[PDB]
């Protein structure tokens, strides 16, 4: 089988890094294409903040939410990794729309949290999953504390074929209108976070679109989606390697990518 040799070369990566791979890839409808550990619990790290933005974008949609409204801020919403949040402080805000597009494409801690502000916290980001049809799904911290990822615990984790199929919806399920959908698409695809992760290991001609996540416990995360043979789909790989270098774990995930495209194309 080519699903065989998908299994086998992900196993072989697992035990030659002393890494767990979690991955699920669904077709639009969220029919499972192919898995391993898929219902295993990781660590979401900043892949969250893609939903994130899904469930501001449905604010927007739904009339509750405006996407240039200012979100004013002091120097308290500066965290680790707040690289567009401190060049907007001294203008003393972000909207609505330039911190979700930082979240999603520079993985913006301060943004992310000026979000969460606004729209209720990790309960609100929980609810969000909740009523798209993710019950897995949980955010229960803010950053940078929710990335603490200790094994076991549950707080702020997903399963990739939970969060595969929450992809699936969010772009192809109808969860947002077809502008917000194609809005979030191209801040996908020109994501400045991923180019040594997932789609470092995808052929060159097929339209990718990612959010990356890194955690403390070698956590390596890419999530989103992939158009290949002019078929669509959702995309969700985990990774825990506690005793590979930051690039090794890069170069896992850019392999795992190889992996799942000798599957596809077989």
């Given at each position: 089988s080519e699903k065989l040799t998908f299994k086998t070369d992900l196993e072989k990566?697992?035990?030659?890094?002393?890494?767990?791979i979690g991955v699920a890839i669904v077709d639009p409808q969220g029919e499972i294409v192919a898995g391993h550990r898929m219902a295993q619990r990781f660590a979401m790290c900043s892949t969250f903040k893609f939903p994130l933005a899904?469930?501001?974008?449905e604010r927007i949609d739904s009339g509750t939410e405006r996407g240039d409204r200012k979100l004013s801020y002091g120097p308290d919403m500066?965290?680790?990794w707040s690289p567009a949040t401190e060049r907007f402080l001294a203008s003393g805000h972000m909207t609505v729309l330039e911190a979700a597009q930082a979240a999603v494409q520079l993985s913006d801690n301060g943004a992310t949290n000026?979000?969460?502000r606004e729209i209720g916290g990790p309960a609100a980001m929980t609810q969000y999953f909740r009523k798209i049809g993710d019950s897995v799904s949980r955010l229960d911290r803010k950053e940078p504390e929710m990335s603490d990822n200790t094994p076991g615990d549950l707080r702020d984790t997903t399963t990739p074929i939970a969060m595969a199929r929450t992809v699936a919806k969010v772009l192809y399920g109808g969860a947002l209108t077809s502008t917000s959908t194609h809005t979030?698409?191209?801040?996908?695809?020109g994501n400045q976070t991923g180019d040594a992760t997932l789609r470092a290991g995808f052929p060159k001609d097929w339209v990718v679109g990612e959010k990356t996540g890194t955690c403390a416990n070698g956590a390596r995360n890419d999530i989103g989606f992939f158009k290949a043979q002019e078929r669509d789909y959702a995309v969700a790989v985990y990774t825990t390697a506690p005793k590979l270098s930051a690039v090794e774990r890069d170069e896992l995930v850019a392999s795992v990518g190889q992996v799942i495209t000798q599957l596809i194309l077989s």
């Open positions: 990566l697992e035990r030659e890094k002393a890494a767990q899904a469930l501001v974008f500066i965290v680790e000026l979000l969460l979030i698409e191209r801040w996908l695809i």
